Structure formats: C-alpha cells, structure tokens
C-alpha cells in the first residue's frame, strides 16, 4: 500500500524516487535481501556511491548517514532503511 | 548463546572484540536499536569512524563495507550486522 515515512532527512525529489524504486522492487521480489539489493544497486548507479539498504519486519539500527540522504519508511509490513555514506 | 558467525570479511582479533562488545550490550539493553547503538558508538571510538550496526530477527540487507571490516553473526535468536565505512 501507500508508503509511510517514519523518519527522514532528505529532499522531496530523492525521497519520491527511493519510494518509487522500492515499490517497483516489491512488484518483482519477495525476499528481503533481493529487495534491498536491487534498491541499493539502483541508487548507487543513479545517485553515486555509497548506499546501504535494510528491509525487514524486525530490526533496530544505528548508523551514520550523509546529511540529506536518509529515509526510513514502511510499505505494508516491511520497514525500509535507506541511507548514503562516503 | 554461543555466537555463530554466518558471514565475514574480518580479522580474528577485531571479530572477537565485536562479539565481546555485542554480548556485553545484551546484558545492558532491551531494545535492538539500543544494542546496535552502543556497539556502533563503541567501535567508532575504539577503531575510528564510521561504523554501522543492525540488530534484529527479521531483515535482509545489502551494504558496502571497508575491506576487512564486516561481520554478520547470531547470538541466540538475534542477528547482528556490523560493518565499517570511511
């Protein structure tokens, strides 16, 4: 269903693209690792290195991200943590 | 309770320390995020930035890590993903 953003430090444009790419991934892949890998790789290509993606129903995370390059959101039961580092 | 390493690119010494810091964290915090946080922060201080930690029972992930600075392991039912970037 409709993505629910639970934390962000990111521009609207980049956010929308991450959400779109993530939704597209869900039409093709069910395994969390598959979903994470396709999002990560697409963002590396489109926006430059280095991106990291976690997809799951149960995790806690503590990471460092470039400013303006962080978003954490649900699509359905799946949480997505997507962020960029040097 | 004995840690089980599932995947790694790491030296034995750094691995042993990460495992040790992680077990200690379990004695001290009830939330996955806080376990991840204390491990992340301790590694930043001890080994230099920048570390990232995910702790959970259900997730897939695709990340990029500095050579020799990645370990993925379980302690009991809990999975730990620990890695370093620049």
């Amino acid at each position: 269903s409709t993505p629910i953003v639970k934390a962000s430090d990111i521009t609207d444009k980049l956010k929308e693209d991450i959400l779109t790419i993530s939704k597209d991934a869900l039409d093709k892949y069910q395994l969390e690792r598959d979903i994470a890998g396709t999002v990560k790789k697409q963002l590396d290509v489109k926006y430059g290195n280095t991106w990291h993606v976690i997809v799951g129903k149960n995790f806690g995370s503590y990471v460092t991200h470039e400013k303006g390059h962080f978003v954490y959101f649900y699509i359905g039961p799946l949480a997505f943590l997507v962020f960029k580092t040097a | 309770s004995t840690p089980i390493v599932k995947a790694s690119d790491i030296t034995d010494k750094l691995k042993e320390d990460i495992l040790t810091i992680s077990k200690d964290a379990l004695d001290k915090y009830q939330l996955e995020r806080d376990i991840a946080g204390t491990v992340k922060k301790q590694l930043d201080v001890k080994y230099g930035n920048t570390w990232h930690v995910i702790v959970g029972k259900n997730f897939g992930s695709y990340v990029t890590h500095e050579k020799g600075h990645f370990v993925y392991f379980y302690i009991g039912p809990l999975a730990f993903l620990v890695f370093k970037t620049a």
Binding site: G56, N58, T64, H65, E66, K67, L81 | R33, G37
Partner: peptide, 11 residues
C-alpha cells in the same frame, strides 16, 4: 556533513 540515526521497527 554527516549525522547519526537510531531506529527501531514497530514490531
């Protein structure tokens, strides 16, 4: 510039 984020899934 860089910043730290801590997150806990709902479940």
């Amino acid at each position: 510039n860089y910043a730290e984020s801590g997150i806990q899934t709902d479940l």
